[PDB]
Amino acid sequence: LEVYTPKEIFVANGTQGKLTCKFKSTSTTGGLTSVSWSFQPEGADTTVSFFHYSQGQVYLGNYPPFKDRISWAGDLDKKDASINIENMQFIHNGTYICDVKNPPDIVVQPGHIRLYVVEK
């Protein structure tokens, strides 16, 4: 299991951000595979999970900054763990972390994206 993400994403204020995540694994994906996305705020020690996918089901979270902005944009059959975030603001500047599990492959380094919400 190895996780690939862009080094950085630049998104225009108020537009949609496409957090792209792709992975390779020795094992086929299916019922057991899971994706987690966490948000590390800019200049902050902390990381918070806000999205999660397992058992074919998408679990959005009530974390205020991302509430009602998150959508699953990936396909596990294409090994795509992407998500979208709508109406991006200054608050969403940070580091985004894609964690993927695909049993029996669990030894994973998580992908890192650095995202700035900037104005054209």
Place this chain on the structure above:
Amino acid sequence: ALEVYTPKEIFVANGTQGKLTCKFKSTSTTGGLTSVSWSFQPEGADTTVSFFHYSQGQVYLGNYPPFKDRISWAGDLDKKDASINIENMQFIHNGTYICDVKNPPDIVVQPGHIRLYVVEKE
């Protein structure tokens, strides 16, 4: 709501068993949806690496060399316990240990962090 509870620090005497304690609190019950992951971040290292995954009743052991054939599931989900045991802890196991818990529909959580030192005295 969900929250993860681990000790700030652990001291394990070289060549003894280490017990990484994880207890979580959540609003929804536990069961077939909840999963656990432990990861390791070596001393003075940028990277983190998952080495244990519990999910769907099944314990998954990694082959990552430092912890291969050393990990055991020492939690119980009905007690909201996510602990694991590390056998024959040696110098290379000094680092920071991170427990993550997802208990659908409760998925918003900060991962618990332990700084673990394996030493000869105390």
